[PDB]
Design a protein around this ligand. Sequence first.
Ligand SMILES: *[C@](O)(C(N)=O)[C@H](C[C@@H]1CCNC1=O)NC(=O)[C@H](CC1CC1)n1ccnc(NC(=O)OC(C)(C)C)c1=O
Ligand SMILES: *[C@](O)(C(N)=O)[C@H](C[C@@H]1CCNC1=O)NC(=O)[C@H](CC1CC1)n1ccnc(NC(=O)OC(C)(C)C)c1=O
Lengths: 306, 303
Amino acid sequence: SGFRKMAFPSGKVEGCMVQVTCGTTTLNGLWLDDVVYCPRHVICTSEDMLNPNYEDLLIRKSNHNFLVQAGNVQLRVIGHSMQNCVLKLKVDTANPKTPKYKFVRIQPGQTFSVLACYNGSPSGVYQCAMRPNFTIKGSFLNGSCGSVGFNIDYDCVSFCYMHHMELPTGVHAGTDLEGNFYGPFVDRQTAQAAGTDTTITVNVLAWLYAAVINGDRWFLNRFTTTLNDFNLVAMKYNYEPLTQDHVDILGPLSAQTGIAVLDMCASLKELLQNGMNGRTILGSALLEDEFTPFDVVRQCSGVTFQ
Amino acid sequence: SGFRKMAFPSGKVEGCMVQVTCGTTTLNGLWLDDVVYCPRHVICTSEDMLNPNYEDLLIRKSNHNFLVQAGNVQLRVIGHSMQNCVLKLKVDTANPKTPKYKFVRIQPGQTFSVLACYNGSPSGVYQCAMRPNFTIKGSFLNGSCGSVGFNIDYDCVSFCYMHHMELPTGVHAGTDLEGNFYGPFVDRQTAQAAGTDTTITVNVLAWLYAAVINGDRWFLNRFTTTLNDFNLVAMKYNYEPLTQDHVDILGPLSAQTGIAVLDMCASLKELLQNGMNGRTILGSALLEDEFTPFDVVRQCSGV
Ligand SMILES: *[C@](O)(C(N)=O)[C@H](C[C@@H]1CCNC1=O)NC(=O)[C@H](CC1CC1)n1ccnc(NC(=O)OC(C)(C)C)c1=O
Ligand SMILES: *[C@](O)(C(N)=O)[C@H](C[C@@H]1CCNC1=O)NC(=O)[C@H](CC1CC1)n1ccnc(NC(=O)OC(C)(C)C)c1=O
């Protein structure tokens, strides 16, 4: 009972967070086995940031210019390399708290938890989605760079995001753990703007199913719709196209509630056309689009991690 | 920048969660030192749950009836006792991951993180306020009982809530870690209901400050209100009276933004009277009251 925006338990990731310092610059790194991953811009001064040549700047560094701290233990750096926009520091000590992990690249619409960190110390955890415009709506102050996003599957931590920068309007951009940016952004202090964002339609539908599961049913109407006719209406409200794959993905929640996906689509079509008229759904006055179908099932069925 | 509902990192608490089974009931316990804390209704059969005589039920139990598992490992129960609505199971092994901790009783309007768990295994983390009506708007399924709420200050975990029950409307009730319920609720199967709730005024003002700090400033206006005139309006909308103590508590946010509390109050009055006319604040179309002044400072400064 109840429905809440919920993050994964963060403990397995907390035990991987370190502080990385290069000259004057400090930010966070991810310690897994005998490697620390962090944003490559740790090697820049503020001077360099307008248009840094990272290959050149790194050549001029040595292992000893990297101070890595795990709490109050310094980790000795014995190698370094750059992969895209991440720096990999080889250290002489493997992290005893390394979880089972993998590195994944997520798609727009997918959600994940962020462990916000400062100076290598976890400070808070919250749930985000990769927006269609390849930004995230995060909460990040100076010092947060190198904080990561992740999912847990059973015992396995999938790292999908490392934080690098803030864009206009206070949204955020970063890379996968191979250092490739999500979106067309670059790690440079230069004019960049996100494209126009859109609503993640499949997620709105997941959350309408969540609503029904939790006893909110006022928006259910007597109609069905074709996929085509739904998309005609939804594109007019800056909604992402709903695909057959999305319809297929919503199948389990459809069967659970006994409301056909295209019947839910017809309800959403009416909500877009007529508004919510001051009413709320699951305690929100807007349609929520940062719960995936999986997120809904997970929360409504109580799936667990150890 | 940016402003998100944010829970504390849950690792220190995760290291304390165990599974407790008695008979056919399995739920969660909190393992600190050599004691496991859980809801006493773990000892009930469903027929007991009508008006359980806990004292007498517990006398009939053996330490052997309590199956406590921490991951793979069975913890032998060597002692049991009861404190209000909480059961304490002494075990023969002290939790090596016990953090620095305290048990606190939270006040209505204050917030805490919940670690929802099932079968002693962590499921998820989220933030709740203790409502004025002594409920929390949580997300809990069968098996979640014994999940706890907490705040972390530096390295010290302040435990403030343990989960016992759901109420009509899909809200939740529970106890402090001494087993005393928040609100007038009782741990038995009997029809119970939350009283009428009120909106935490000071928290709404904190969140409006958070909005301004993050550059969302459209609702600011050149007007001010007296404290009394503010309360006359807001109390019509079932907002808690704003006291001078509240105004004082907001002083750091007032100072950070340069907006006096009674200036911000004029925004709030106008939002209540006229609504948002299609606009949002920090991406919400409603006024949010589950962020404390501390939560906003913490998040807009980065502790
Ligand atoms: C990161 O370097 C750190 N040490 O924490 C930092 C994190 C940001 C600080 C405020 N919010 C953040 O998310 N990143 C940066 O400061 C980047 C570094 C660049 C290599 C990527 N950075 C530098 C300069 N400017 C910006 N943003 C900016 O100008 O924002 C506007 C467009 C909104 C004005 C930036 O992110
Ligand atoms: C808890 O015992 C557990 N094993 O997890 C459980 C948690 C709830 C189940 C669904 N979501 C929860 O939060 N608690 C209960 O089942 C309590 C036990 C009572 C001693 C306190 N309980 C028992 C009976 N009824 C209710 N409430 C109830 O039926 O609420 C309705 C009217 C909204 C359906 C209850 O919480």
